[PDB]
Design a protein around this ligand. Structure first.
Ligand SMILES: [Cl-]
Ligand SMILES: [Cl-]
Length: 162
């Protein structure tokens, strides 16, 4: 298991524009296009991202390329954030994947906001962090996914995804 396989399981793969759990236009492997309610704005963003007049549909290859970029960006986002960086540096390789997943789903800013949880992860207080992470809108809105991610922080293994 690795970050790419992990995220492919959580987000799935769709080659036509679709709406995410929050109702925003998305494509590929969880690639958010726009928060705007307009399909046209979505199509415009898609074309600009791919570099061609798309018709709202992309190929597998294009979807993978946006996926690679997005994972790269999530990592860099963590490394550049003052609140995240120290946490990431303190974690083992499996748990690092869990943090990237959260940033990929909610953004750097969003994650950076889990102040207390972050301090507990840094302290290696796994069960306590797991409970704290659960008291969140994130958990209540996408509980199965959150449970998988939290199980990783709790156990340090990939069992949740196997
Ligand atoms: Cl992009
Ligand atoms: Cl879910």
């Amino acid at each position: 298991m690795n970050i790419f396989e992990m995220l492919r399981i959580d987000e799935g793969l769709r080659l036509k524009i679709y709406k995410d759990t929050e109702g925003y236009y998305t494509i590929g492997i969880g690639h958010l296009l726009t928060k705007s309610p307009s399909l046209n704005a979505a199509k415009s963003e898609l074309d600009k991202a791919i570099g061609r007049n798309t018709n709202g549909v992309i190929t597998k290859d294009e979807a993978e390329k946006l996926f690679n970029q997005d994972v790269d960006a999530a990592v860099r986002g963590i490394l550049r954030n003052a609140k995240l960086k120290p946490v990431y540096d303190s974690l083992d390789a499996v748990r690092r994947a869990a943090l990237i997943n959260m940033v990929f789903q909610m953004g750097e800013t969003g994650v950076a906001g889990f102040t207390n949880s972050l301090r507990m992860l840094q302290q290696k207080r796994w069960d306590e962090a797991a409970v704290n992470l659960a008291k969140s809108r994130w958990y209540n809105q996408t509980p199965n996914r959150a449970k998988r991610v939290i199980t990783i922080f709790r156990t340090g293994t990939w069992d949740a995804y196997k």
